[PDB]
mmCIF file of C-alpha atoms in Angstrom:
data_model
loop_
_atom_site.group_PDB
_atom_site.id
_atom_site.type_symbol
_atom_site.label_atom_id
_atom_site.label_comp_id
_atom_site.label_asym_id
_atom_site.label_seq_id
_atom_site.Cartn_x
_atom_site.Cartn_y
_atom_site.Cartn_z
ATOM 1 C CA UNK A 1 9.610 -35.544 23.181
ATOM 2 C CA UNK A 2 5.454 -35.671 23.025
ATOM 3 C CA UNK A 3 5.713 -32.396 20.781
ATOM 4 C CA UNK A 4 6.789 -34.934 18.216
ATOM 5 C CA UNK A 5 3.197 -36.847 18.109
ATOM 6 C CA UNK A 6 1.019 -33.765 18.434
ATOM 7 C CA UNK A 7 2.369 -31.777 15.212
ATOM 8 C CA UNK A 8 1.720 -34.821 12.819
ATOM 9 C CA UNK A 9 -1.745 -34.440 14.183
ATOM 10 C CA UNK A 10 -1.993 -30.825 13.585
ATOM 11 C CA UNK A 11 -0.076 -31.337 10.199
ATOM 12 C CA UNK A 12 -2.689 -33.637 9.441
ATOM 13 C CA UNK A 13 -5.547 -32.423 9.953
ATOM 14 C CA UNK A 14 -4.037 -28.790 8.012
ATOM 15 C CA UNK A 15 -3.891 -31.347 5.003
ATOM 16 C CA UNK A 16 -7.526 -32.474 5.722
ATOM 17 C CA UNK A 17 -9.470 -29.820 6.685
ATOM 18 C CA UNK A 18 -8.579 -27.994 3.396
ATOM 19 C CA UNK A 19 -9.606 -31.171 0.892
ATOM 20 C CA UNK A 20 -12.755 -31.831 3.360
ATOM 21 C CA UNK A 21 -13.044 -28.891 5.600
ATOM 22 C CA UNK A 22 -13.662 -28.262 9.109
ATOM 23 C CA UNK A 23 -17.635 -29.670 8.648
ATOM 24 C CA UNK A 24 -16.848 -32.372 6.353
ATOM 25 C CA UNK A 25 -14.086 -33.673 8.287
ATOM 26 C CA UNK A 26 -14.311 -36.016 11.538
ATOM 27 C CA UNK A 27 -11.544 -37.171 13.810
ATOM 28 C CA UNK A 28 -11.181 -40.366 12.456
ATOM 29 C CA UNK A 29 -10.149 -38.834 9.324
ATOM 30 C CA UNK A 30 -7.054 -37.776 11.173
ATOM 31 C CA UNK A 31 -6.539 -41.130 12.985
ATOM 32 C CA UNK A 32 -7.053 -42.887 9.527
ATOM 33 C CA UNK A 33 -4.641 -39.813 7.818
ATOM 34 C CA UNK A 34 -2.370 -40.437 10.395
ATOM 35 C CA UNK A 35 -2.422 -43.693 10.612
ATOM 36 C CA UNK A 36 -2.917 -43.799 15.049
ATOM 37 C CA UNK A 37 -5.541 -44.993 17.413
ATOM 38 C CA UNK A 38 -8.430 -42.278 17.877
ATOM 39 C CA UNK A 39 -8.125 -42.670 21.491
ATOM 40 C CA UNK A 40 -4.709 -40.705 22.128
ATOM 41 C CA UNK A 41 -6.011 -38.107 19.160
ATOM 42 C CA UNK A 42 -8.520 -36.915 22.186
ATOM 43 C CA UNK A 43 -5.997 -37.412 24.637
ATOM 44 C CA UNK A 44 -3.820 -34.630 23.067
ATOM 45 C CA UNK A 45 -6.867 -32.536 21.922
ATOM 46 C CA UNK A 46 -10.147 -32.634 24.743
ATOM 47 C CA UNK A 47 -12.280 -31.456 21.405
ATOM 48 C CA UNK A 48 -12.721 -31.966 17.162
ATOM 49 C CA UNK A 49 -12.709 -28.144 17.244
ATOM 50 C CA UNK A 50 -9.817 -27.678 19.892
ATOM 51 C CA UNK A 51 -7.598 -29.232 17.197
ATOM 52 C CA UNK A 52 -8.356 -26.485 14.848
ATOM 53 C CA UNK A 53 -7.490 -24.325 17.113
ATOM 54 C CA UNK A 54 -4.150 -25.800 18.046
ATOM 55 C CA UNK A 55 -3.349 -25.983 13.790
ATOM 56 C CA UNK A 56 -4.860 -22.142 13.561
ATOM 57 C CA UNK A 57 -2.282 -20.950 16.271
ATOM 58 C CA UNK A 58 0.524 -22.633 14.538
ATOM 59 C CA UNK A 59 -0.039 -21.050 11.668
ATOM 60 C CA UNK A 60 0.060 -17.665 12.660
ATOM 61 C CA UNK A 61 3.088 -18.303 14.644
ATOM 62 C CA UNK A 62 4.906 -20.141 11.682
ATOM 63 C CA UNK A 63 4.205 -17.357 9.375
ATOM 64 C CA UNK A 64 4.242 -14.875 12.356
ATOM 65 C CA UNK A 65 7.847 -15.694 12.910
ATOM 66 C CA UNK A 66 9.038 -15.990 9.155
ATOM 67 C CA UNK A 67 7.644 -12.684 7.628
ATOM 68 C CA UNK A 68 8.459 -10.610 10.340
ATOM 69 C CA UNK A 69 12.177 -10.525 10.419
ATOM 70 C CA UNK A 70 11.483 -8.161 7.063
ATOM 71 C CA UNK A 71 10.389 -5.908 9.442
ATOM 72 C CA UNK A 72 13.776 -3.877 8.320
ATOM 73 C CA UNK A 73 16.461 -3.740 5.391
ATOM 74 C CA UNK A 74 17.935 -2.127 2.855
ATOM 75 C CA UNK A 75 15.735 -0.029 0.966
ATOM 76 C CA UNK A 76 12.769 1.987 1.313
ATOM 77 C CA UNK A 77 9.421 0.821 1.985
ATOM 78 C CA UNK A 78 9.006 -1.072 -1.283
ATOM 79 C CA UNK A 79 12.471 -2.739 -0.939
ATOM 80 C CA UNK A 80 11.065 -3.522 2.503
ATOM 81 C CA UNK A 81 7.532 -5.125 1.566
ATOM 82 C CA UNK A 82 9.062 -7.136 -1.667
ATOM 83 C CA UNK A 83 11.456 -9.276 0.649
ATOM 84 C CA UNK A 84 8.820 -10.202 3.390
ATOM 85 C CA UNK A 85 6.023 -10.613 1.099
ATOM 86 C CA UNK A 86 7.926 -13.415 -0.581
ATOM 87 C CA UNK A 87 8.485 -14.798 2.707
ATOM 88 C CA UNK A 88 4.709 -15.282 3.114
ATOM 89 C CA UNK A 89 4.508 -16.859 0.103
ATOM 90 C CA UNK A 90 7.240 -19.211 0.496
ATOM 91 C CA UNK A 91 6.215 -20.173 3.731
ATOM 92 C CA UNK A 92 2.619 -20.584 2.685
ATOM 93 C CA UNK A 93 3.758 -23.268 0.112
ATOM 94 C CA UNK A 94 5.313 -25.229 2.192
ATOM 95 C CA UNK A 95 3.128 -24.197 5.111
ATOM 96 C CA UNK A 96 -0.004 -24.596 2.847
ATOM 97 C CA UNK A 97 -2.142 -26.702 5.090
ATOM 98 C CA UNK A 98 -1.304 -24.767 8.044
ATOM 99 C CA UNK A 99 -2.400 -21.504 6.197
ATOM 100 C CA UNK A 100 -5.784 -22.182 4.609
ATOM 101 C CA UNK A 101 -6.972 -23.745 8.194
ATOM 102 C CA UNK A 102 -6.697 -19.933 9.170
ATOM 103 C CA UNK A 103 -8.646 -18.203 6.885
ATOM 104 C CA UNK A 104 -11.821 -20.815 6.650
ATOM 105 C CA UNK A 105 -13.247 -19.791 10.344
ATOM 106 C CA UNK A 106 -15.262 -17.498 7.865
ATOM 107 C CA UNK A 107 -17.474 -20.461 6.747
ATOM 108 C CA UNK A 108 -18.303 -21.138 10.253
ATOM 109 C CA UNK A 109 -18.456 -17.765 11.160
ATOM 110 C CA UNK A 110 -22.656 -17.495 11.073
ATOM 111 C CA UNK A 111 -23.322 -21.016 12.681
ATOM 112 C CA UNK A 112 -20.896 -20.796 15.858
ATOM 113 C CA UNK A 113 -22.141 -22.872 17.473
ATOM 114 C CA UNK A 114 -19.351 -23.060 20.008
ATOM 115 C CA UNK A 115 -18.450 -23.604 24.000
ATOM 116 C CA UNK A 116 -17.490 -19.965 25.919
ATOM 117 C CA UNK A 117 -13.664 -21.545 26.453
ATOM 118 C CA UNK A 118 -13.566 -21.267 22.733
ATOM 119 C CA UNK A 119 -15.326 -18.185 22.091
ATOM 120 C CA UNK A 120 -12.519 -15.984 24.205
ATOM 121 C CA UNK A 121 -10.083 -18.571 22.716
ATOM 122 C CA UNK A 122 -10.659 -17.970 19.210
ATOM 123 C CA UNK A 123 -11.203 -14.526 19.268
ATOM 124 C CA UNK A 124 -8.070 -14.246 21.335
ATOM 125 C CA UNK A 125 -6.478 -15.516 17.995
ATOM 126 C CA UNK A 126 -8.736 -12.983 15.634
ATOM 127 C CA UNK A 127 -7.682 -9.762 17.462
ATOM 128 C CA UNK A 128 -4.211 -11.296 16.819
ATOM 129 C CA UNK A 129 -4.808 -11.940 13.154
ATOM 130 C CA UNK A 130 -5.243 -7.529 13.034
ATOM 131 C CA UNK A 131 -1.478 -7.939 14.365
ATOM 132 C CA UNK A 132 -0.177 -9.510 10.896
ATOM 133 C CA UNK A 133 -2.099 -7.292 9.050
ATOM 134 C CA UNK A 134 -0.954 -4.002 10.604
ATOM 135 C CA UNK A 135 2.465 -5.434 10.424
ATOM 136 C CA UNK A 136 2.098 -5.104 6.700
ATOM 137 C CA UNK A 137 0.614 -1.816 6.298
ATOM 138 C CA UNK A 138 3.344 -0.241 8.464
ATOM 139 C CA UNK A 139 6.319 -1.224 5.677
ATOM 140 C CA UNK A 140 4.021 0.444 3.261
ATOM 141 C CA UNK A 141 3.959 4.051 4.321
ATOM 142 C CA UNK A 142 7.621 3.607 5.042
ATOM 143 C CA UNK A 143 8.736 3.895 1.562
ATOM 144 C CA UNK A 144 5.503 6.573 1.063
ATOM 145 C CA UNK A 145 7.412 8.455 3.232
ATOM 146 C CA UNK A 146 10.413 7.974 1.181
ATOM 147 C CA UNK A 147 8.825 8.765 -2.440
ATOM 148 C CA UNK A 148 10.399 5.500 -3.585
ATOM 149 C CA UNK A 149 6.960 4.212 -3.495
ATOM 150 C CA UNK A 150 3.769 5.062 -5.238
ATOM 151 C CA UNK A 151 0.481 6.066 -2.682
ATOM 152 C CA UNK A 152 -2.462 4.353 -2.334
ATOM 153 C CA UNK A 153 -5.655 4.384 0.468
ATOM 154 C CA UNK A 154 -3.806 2.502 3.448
ATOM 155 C CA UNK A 155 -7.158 1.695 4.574
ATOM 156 C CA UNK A 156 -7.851 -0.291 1.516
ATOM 157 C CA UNK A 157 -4.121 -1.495 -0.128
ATOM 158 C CA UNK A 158 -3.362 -3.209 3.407
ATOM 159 C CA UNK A 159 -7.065 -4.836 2.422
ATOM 160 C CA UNK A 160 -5.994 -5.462 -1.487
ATOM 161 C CA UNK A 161 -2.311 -6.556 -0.380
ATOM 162 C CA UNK A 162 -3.297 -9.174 2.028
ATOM 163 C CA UNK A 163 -6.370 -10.406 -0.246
ATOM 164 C CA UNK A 164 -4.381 -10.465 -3.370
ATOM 165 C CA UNK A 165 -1.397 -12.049 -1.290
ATOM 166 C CA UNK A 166 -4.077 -14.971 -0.110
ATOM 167 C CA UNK A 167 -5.363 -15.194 -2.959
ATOM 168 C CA UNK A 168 -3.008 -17.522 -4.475
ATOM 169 C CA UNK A 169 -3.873 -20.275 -2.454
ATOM 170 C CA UNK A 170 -7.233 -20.830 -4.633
ATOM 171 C CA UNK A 171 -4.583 -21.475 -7.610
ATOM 172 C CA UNK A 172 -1.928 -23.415 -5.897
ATOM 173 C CA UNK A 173 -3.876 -26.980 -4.676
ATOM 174 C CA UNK A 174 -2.385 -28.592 -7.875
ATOM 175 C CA UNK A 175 0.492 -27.079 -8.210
ATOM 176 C CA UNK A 176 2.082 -28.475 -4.665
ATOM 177 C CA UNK A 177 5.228 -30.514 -5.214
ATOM 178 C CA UNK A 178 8.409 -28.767 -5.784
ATOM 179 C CA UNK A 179 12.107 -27.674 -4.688
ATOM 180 C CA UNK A 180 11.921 -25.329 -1.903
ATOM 181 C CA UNK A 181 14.282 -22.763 -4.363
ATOM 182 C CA UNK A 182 11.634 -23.279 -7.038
ATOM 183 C CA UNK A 183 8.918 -21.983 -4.791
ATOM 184 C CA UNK A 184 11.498 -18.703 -3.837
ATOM 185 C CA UNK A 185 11.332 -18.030 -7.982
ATOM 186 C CA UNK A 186 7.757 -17.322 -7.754
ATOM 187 C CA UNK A 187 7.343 -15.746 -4.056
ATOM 188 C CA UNK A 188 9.960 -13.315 -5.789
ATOM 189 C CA UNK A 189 8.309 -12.701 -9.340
ATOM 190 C CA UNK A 190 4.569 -13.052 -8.059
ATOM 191 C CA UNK A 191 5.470 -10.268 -4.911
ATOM 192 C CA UNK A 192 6.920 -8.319 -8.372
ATOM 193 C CA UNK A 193 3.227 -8.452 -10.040
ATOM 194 C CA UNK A 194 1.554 -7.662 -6.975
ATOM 195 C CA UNK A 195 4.194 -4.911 -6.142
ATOM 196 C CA UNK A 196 6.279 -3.385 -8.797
ATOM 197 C CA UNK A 197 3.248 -3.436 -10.826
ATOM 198 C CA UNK A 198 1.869 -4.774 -14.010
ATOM 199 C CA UNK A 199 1.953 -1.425 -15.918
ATOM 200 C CA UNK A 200 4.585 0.587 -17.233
ATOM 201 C CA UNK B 1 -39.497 -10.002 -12.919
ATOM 202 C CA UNK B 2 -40.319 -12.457 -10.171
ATOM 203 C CA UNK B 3 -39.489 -15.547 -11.687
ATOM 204 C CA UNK B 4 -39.816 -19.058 -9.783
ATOM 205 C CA UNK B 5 -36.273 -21.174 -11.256
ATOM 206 C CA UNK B 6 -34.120 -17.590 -10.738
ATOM 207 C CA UNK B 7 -35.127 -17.166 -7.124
ATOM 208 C CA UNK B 8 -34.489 -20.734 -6.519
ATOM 209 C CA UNK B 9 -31.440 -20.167 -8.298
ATOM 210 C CA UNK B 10 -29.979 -17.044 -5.897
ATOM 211 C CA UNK B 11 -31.680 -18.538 -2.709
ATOM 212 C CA UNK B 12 -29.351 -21.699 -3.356
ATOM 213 C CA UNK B 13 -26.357 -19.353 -4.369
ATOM 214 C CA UNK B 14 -26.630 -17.180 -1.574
ATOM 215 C CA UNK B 15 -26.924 -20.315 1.187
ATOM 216 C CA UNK B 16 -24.278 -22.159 -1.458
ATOM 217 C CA UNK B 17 -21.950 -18.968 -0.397
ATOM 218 C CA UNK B 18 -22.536 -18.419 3.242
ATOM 219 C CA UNK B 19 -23.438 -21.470 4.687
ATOM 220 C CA UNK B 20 -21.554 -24.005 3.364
ATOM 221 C CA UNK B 21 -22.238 -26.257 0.406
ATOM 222 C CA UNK B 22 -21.692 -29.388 2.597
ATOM 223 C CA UNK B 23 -24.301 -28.272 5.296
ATOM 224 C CA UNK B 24 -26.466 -25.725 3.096
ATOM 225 C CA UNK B 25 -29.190 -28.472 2.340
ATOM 226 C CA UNK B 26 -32.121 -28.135 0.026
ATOM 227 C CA UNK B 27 -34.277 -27.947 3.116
ATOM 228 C CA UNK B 28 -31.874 -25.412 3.715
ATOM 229 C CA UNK B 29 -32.497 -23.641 0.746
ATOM 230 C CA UNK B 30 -36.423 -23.930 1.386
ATOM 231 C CA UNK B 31 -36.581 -21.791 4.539
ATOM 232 C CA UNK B 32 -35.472 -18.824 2.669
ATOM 233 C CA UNK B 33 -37.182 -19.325 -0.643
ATOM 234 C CA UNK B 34 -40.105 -19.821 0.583
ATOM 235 C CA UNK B 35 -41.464 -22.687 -1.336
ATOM 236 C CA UNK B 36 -42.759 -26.128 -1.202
ATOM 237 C CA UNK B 37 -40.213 -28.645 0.170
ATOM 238 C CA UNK B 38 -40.657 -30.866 -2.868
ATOM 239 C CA UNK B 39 -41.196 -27.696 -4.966
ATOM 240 C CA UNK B 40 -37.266 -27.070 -5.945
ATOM 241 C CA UNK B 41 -36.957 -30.698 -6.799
ATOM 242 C CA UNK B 42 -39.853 -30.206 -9.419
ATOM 243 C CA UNK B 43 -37.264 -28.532 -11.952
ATOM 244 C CA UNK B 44 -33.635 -29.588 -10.828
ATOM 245 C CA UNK B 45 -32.964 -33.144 -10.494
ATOM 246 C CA UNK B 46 -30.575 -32.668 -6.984
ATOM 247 C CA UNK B 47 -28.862 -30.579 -4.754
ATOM 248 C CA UNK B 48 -25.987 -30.543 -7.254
ATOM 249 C CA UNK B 49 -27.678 -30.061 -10.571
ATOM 250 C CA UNK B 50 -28.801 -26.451 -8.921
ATOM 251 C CA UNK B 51 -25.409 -26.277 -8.397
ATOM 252 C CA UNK B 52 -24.916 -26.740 -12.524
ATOM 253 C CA UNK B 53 -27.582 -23.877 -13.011
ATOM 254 C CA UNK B 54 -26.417 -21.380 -10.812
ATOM 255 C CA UNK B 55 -22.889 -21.785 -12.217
ATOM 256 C CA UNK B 56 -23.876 -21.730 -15.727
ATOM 257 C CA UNK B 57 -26.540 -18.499 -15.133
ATOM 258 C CA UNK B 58 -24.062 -16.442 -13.036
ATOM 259 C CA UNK B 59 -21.140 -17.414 -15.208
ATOM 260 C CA UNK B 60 -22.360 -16.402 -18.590
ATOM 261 C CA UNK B 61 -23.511 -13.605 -17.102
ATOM 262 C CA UNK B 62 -20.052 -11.814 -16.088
ATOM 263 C CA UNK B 63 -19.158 -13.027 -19.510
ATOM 264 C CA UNK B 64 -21.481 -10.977 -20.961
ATOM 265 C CA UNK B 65 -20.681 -8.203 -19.087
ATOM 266 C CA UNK B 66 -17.029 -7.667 -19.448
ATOM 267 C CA UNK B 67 -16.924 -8.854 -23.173
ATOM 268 C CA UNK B 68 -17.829 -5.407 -24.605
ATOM 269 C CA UNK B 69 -15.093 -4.207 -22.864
ATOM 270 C CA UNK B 70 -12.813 -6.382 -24.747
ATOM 271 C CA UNK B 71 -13.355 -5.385 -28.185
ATOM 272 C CA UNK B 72 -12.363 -1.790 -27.714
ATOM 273 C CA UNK B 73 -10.207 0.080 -29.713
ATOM 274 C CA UNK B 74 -7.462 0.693 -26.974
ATOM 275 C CA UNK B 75 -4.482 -0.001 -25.486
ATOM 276 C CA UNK B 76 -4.148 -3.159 -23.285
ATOM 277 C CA UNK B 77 -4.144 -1.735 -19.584
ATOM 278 C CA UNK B 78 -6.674 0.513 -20.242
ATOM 279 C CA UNK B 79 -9.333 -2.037 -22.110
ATOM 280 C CA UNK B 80 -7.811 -4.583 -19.302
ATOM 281 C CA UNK B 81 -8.718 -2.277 -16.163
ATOM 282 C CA UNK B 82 -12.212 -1.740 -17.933
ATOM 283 C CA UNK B 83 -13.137 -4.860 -17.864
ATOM 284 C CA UNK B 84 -11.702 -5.871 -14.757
ATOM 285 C CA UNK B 85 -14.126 -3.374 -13.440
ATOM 286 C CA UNK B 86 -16.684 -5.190 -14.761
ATOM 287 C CA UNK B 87 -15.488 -8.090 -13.227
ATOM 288 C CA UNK B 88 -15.554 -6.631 -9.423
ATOM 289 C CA UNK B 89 -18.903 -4.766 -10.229
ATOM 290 C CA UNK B 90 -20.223 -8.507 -11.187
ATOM 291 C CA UNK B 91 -18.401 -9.971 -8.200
ATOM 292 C CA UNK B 92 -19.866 -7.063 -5.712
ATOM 293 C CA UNK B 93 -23.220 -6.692 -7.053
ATOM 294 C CA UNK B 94 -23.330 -10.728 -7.886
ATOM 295 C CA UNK B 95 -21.218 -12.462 -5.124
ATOM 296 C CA UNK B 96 -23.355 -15.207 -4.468
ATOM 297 C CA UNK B 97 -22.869 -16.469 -7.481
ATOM 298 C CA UNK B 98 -19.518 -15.373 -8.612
ATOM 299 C CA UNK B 99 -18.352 -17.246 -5.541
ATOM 300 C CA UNK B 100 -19.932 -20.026 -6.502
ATOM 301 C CA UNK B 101 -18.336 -20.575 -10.383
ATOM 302 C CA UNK B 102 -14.860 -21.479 -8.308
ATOM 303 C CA UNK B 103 -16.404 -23.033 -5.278
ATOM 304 C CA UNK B 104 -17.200 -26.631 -6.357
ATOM 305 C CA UNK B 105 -15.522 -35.299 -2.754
ATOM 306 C CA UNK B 106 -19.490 -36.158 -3.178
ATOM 307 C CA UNK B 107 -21.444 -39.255 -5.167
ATOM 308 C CA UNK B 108 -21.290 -37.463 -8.762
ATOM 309 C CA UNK B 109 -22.906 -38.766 -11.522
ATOM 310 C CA UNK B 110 -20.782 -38.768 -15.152
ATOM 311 C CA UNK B 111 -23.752 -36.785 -16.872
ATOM 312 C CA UNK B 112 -23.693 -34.017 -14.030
ATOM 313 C CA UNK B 113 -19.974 -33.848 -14.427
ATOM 314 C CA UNK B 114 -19.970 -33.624 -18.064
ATOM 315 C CA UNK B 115 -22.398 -30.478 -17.492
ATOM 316 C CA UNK B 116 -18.996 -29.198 -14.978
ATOM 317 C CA UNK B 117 -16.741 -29.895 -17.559
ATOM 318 C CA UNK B 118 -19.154 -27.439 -19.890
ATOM 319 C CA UNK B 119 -18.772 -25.165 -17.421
ATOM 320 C CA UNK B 120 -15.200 -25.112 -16.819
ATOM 321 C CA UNK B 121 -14.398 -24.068 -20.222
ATOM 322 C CA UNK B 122 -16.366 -21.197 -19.546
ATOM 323 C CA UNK B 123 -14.276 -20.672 -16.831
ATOM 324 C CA UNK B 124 -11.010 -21.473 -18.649
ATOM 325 C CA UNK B 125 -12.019 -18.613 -21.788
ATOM 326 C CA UNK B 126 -13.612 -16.172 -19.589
ATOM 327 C CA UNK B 127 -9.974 -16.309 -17.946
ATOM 328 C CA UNK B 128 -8.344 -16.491 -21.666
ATOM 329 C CA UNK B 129 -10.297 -13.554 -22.446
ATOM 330 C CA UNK B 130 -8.212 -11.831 -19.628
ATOM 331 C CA UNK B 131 -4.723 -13.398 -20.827
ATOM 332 C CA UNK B 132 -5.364 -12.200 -24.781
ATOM 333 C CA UNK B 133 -5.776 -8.901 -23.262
ATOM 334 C CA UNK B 134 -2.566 -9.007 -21.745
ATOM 335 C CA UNK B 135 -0.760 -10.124 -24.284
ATOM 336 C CA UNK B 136 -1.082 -7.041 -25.713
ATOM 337 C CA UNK B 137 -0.728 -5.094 -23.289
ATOM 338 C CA UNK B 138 2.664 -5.900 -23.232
ATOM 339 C CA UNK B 139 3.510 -6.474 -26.569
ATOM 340 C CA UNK B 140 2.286 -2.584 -26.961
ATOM 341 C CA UNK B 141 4.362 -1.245 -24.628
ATOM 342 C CA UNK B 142 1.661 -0.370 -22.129
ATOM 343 C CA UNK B 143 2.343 -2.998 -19.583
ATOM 344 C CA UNK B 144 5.753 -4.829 -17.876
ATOM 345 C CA UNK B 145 6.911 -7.240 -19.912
ATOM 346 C CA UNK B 146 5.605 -9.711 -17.230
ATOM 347 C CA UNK B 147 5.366 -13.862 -17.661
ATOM 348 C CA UNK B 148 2.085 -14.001 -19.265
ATOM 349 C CA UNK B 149 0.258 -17.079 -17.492
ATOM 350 C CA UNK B 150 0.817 -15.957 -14.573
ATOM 351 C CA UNK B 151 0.052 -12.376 -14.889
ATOM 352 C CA UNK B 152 -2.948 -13.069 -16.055
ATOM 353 C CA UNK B 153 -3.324 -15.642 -13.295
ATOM 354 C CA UNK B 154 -2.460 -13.165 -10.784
ATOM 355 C CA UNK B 155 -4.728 -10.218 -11.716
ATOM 356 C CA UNK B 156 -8.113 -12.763 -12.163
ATOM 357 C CA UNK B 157 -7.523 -14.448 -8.348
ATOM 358 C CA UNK B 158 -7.235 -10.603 -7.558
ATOM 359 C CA UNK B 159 -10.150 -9.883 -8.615
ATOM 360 C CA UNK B 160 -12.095 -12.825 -7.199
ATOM 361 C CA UNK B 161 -10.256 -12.309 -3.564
ATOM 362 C CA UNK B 162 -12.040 -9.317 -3.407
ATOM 363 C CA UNK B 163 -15.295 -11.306 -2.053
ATOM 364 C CA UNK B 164 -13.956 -12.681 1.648
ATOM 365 C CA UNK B 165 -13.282 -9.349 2.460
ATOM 366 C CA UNK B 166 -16.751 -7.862 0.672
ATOM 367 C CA UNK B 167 -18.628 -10.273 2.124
ATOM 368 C CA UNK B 168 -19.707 -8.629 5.580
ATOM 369 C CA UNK B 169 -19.473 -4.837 3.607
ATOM 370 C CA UNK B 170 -22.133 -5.276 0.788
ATOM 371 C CA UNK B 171 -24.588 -2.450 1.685
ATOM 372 C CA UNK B 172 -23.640 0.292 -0.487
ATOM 373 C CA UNK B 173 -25.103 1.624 -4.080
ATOM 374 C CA UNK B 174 -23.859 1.102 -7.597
ATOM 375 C CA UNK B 175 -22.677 4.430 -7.356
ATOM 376 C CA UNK B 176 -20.035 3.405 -4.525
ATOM 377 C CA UNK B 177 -19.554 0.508 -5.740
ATOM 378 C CA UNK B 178 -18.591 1.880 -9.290
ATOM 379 C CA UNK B 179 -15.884 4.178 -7.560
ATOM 380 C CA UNK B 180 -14.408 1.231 -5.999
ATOM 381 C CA UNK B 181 -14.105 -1.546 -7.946
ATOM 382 C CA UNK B 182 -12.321 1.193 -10.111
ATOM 383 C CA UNK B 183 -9.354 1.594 -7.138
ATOM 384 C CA UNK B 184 -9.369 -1.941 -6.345
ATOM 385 C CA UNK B 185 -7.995 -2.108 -10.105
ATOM 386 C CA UNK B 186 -5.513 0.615 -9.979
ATOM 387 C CA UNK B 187 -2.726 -1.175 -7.590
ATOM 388 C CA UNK B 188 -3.873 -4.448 -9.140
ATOM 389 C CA UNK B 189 -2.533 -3.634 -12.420
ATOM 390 C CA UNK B 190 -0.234 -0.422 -11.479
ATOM 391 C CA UNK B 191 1.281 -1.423 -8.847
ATOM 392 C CA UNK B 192 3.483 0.921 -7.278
ATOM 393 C CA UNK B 193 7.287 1.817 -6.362
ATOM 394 C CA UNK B 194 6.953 4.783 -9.311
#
C-alpha cells in the first residue's frame, strides 16, 4: 500500500532525531536520510512536529503490543516481570530509534511552543505513557503477593524499574549491530541484574 | 562564596540541562547569570569550552566524593552501596552538572577535544572505580557471581537514570534526600525474588 512509504519516514526520522534531535533536526534531513523529494514528506505529515508524533505513537504501540502479552505465565510475579522485561529490551534494540523519540519530549517540555491540535494530541499520548507504566507495577505485587518476590515501595520500584530499564539506551548507541538471538542473551541476563539482584 | 567563573559555570550547567545544549545559547546563559553579554566570553574562549569547565568541575567533584567510600575496610556490596549513595546524593544535590559529564555533531576544534578526551578518562576510572569494587564483591562471596562489565555497567546507568525522573521533584532537604538515594540503592544492587 501507502503504509509502505510513511514508516520509512517515521523509521527515519527515529534514526535522526536521536543523533540530532528533535531541535537540531529539519525535514530535509529526512528527505536527504531517506533519500525522497521533501514535497510528499509534508504531504504525509501537514507538520515537522506532526511527524514526531506519528514515530512517538508507533513506539508505544510497538512496544505496547510486544511486552504486554507477559501480562501472564508460569510463575509468580518475578517469573512474570523477568519474561516481559526482556521483551522491552529486545524490542528496544531493534526498536531503538522508535524508543528514544519517546522519552526526549522532556527536552522540549519547558519551551512548548506548540499549536492546541497538538497540545490535546500529545498529551493524549502522555496520559497513555502512565498505561505502560502501571502495566509494570501490576506484575510486581503479583509475586509480592506470592512471597516468591522480595518488597519494595511500589510507588518508587515501578519509578526505579522503568528508569533503570531505560536506562540502557544511554549505553547502547555503539553497541547496535547484532543477531536478533544475541540481543535475547542480554534482555535475559541484564532483566537478571536488574531483577534477581546483584547481591547474594 | 560568590564567585564570578562558578556561577557562570552552574548558570551554563543548569540551561546546558534543561534547555537544550543546541538552543541554550550564551545569550541564553546571560539572562540568568546576570552578567555582561561579553562578560562570560572574558574567561572561556566559547560556548563549548564552558562546556569543558563545567564537565571537568562537576566531574572531579563526585570523584571526590565517593572515593572515601572506596577505601573502606568492608565487604564489596556494602562499600559499593556506600558509595553509590554518594553518587545519587551528587546526582540529586548536583544534577545540572552530573547530567552534563554524559551529555556531550558541532565545528570542534582538536585542542577542545583533546580537553574531552581528558575528561573522558575521568569518566572511564570514575566508572572503573565502580567495576574494582565489584570485583570483589563477588569474588568475596557478597554479591552474584554476575558478568562483571556489565554489572558494573548496569548499576552506574542506574544511578545516572535517576535524574529524568528527579528532574521536576528536586525540592526537598539533604535530610530526604539522604534517606532516598539510600532505597534507590537497595533494589539496584539487591534486587529481589528472595
Amino acid at each position: 500500500l501507502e503504509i509502505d512509504v510513511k514508516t520509512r519516514i517515521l523509521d527515519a526520522a527515529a534514526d535522526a532525531f536521536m543523533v540530532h534531535g528533535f531541535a537540531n533536526t529539519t525535514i530535509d534531513d529526512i528527505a536527504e536520510q531517506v533519500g525522497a523529494t521533501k514535497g510528499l514528506i509534508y504531504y504525509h505529515f501537514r507538520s515537522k512536529f506532526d511527524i514526531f508524533l506519528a514515530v512517538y505513537e508507533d513506539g508505544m504501540r510497538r512496544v505496547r503490543e510486544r511486552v504486554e502479552p507477559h501480562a501472564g505465565g508460569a510463575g509468580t510475579g518475578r517469573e512474570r516481570l523477568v519474561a516481559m522485561s526482556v521483551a522491552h529490551l529486545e524490542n528496544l534494540m531493534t526498536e531503538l530509534g522508535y524508543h528514544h523519540v519517546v522519552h526526549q519530549g522532556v527536552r522540549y517540555q519547558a519551551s512548548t511552543a506548540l499549536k492546541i491540535r497538538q497540545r490535546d494530541a500529545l498529551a493524549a499520548l502522555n496520559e497513555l505513557r502512565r498505561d505502560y507504566e502501571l502495566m509494570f507495577r501490576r506484575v510486581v505485587a503479583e509475586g509480592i503477593a506470592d512471597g516468591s518476590l522480595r518488597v519494595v515501595d511500589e510507588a518508587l520500584a515501578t519509578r526505579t524499574l522503568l528508569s533503570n530499564l531505560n536506562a540502557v539506551d544511554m549505553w547502547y548507541r555503539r553497541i547496535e549491530g547484532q543477531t536478533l538471538d544475541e540481543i535475547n542473551e542480554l534482555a535475559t541476563n541484564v532483566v537478571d541484574l536488574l531483577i534477581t539482584g546483584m547481591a547474594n
